[PDB]
Design a protein around this ligand. Structure first.
Ligand SMILES: CCOc1ccc2cc(-c3nn(CC4CCN(C)CC4)c4ncnc(N)c34)ccc2c1
Length: 459
């Protein structure tokens, strides 16, 4: 008598959007236990393996316990999706915590990387590979300063094919091992990705960089990088040595995770007391804040455009569904019919209970309430404005966070960087600017930027 996810768990709120789908904060309807549920849509995400292979991996993952690996509790499957139920962590992504600090040293970076290597070492002993390791996959257990790191998504890449949409692969190219690109890879690919992360922690710049995804990959495939940035003069020789060993091109010659744990640099800078020479890496922390702000604004711009395209689709679809449900032809509908069409639109709303409450938030939001006969036209406007909120609000937030000098504007040099990261062709975005403001002087305010994004998604 195979069990059913929504019989045991109720959705509370959305936590985020990650690799392969949405992560939802959920609650056990009996015990009250809160959990983070990754919901994988079978239609959007193709499987690479067979069901037998996926179920065996899940059964193994549930039995593993390590302080630096996200704990998986439960797995469910229905007709339309897969549900992975794990422990919820509230510290956010590591890099977003790092940029809030005013002090950051080699000791802080070694504490960090020792946890990651310790988690990876354990999973490789159990023959599980991550493959897609990156800063976004490093969560902090809690918002405390002393918080442990938890790696998420260990093992999913083997069974599910990653999205080819740019909104989903932002900041993936920097960390992928070169052997992964060419097809023959093993567990050493996780040491490479960790090496890239360490390079960034100590310099604030990716070792392999470029103006678009494909230029970055051309750099990764060649394998060449350097330590001639000025801020490497402040960094121990020991740390550089570990990096060279992790970023070794030929995987059989690259250091193992387990050996990396024993490296002098990890042994020296993780002893809690000895500060033999420990400066603060001020340039690095500010490079990381620039890096992070750039990536967050490009990501928010793509989700803004995506949300605007969805709201065009859903507005028209919902209107045609309501039109056909309107047997009177008077343009009015009752509550149950509004619920029925919104559910028909279906295909965060994990059960019928989720839908009824969204509709109720909109019927409350219909300003003042007359009960029986509701103007389907206005419900559509408000239901959809609701859906875009998180993404327009988030767009402005990310613009303000990128504009660190509070100038109110972003330069065309900055736009080139942002649109390169978002993979929007150069000729295309300038044509668009030229049409928004025929007189501009190489910089745009938030409203102009916003108008550019709308033109770049056909509005
Ligand atoms: C086999 C593992 O299956 C799972 C189960 C739960 C998961 C949960 C998360 C997760 N994802 N998230 C939030 C988003 C994860 C992706 N980031 C880019 C944005 C935040 C979580 N927040 C708190 N706790 C969590 N557990 C998560 C990520 C991957 C998961 C994979």
């Amino acid at each position: 008598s195979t069990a059913i996810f929504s019989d045991r768990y109720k959705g509370q709120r959305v936590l985020g959007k990650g690799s392969f789908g949405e992560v939802i904060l959920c609650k056990d309807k009996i015990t009250g236990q809160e959990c983070a549920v990754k919901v994988i849509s079978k239609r959007q995400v193709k499987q690479k393996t067979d069901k037998e292979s996926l179920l065996r991996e899940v059964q193994l993952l549930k039995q593993l316990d390590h302080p630096n690996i996200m704990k998986l509790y439960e797995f469910f499957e229905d007709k339309g999706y897969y549900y992975l139920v794990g422990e919820v962590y509230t510290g956010g992504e590591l890099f977003d915590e790092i940029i809030s600090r005013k002090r950051f040293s080699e000791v802080d970076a070694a504490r960090i990387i020792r946890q990651v290597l310790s988690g990876i070492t354990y999973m490789h002993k159990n023959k599980i590979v991550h493959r897609d390791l990156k800063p976004e996959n490093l969560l902090l257990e809690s918002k405390s300063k002393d918080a442990n790191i938890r790696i998420i998504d260990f093992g999913l890449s083997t069974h599910f094919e990653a999205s080819k949409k740019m909104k989903d692969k932002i900041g993936t190219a920097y960390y992928i091992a070169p052997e992964v690109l060419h097809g023959t890879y093993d567990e050493k690919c996780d040491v490479w990705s960790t090496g890239v992360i360490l390079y960034i922690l100590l310099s604030g710049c990716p070792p392999f960089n470029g103006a678009n995804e494909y230029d970055i990959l051309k750099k990764v495939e060649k394998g060449k990088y350097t330590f001639e940035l000025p801020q490497w003069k402040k960094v121990s020789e020991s740390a550089k040595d570990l990096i060279r060993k992790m970023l070794t091109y030929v995987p059989s010659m690259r250091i193992s995770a387990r050996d990396a744990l024993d490296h002098e640099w990890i042994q020296t800078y993780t002893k809690e007391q000895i500060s033999v020479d420990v400066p603060s890496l001020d340039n690095a922390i500010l490079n990381i804040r620039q890096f992070q702000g750039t990536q967050k604004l490009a990501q928010a711009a793509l989700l803004y455009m995506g949300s605007k395209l969805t709201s065009q689709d859903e507005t028209k679809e919902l209107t045609a569904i309501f039109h056909k449900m309107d047997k009177n032809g008077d343009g009015q509908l009752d509550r149950a019919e509004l619920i029925e069409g919104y559910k028909e639109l279906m295909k965060s709303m994990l059960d019928a209970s989720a839908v009824e409450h969204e509709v109720d938030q909109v019927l409350d939001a219909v300003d003042f309430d007359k009960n029986g006969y509701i103007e389907y036209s206005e419900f559509v406007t408000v239901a959809m404005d609701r859906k875009t909120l998180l993404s327009r609000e988030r767009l402005e937030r990310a613009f303000r966070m990128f504009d660190s000098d509070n100038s109110g504007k972003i330069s065309s040099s900055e736009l080139a960087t942002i649109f390169g990261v978002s993979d929007v062709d150069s000729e295309t975005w300038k044509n668009v600017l030229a049409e928004v403001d025929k007189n501009n002087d190489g910089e745009v305010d938030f409203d102009e930027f916003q108008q550019m994004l709308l033109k770049l998604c056909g509005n």
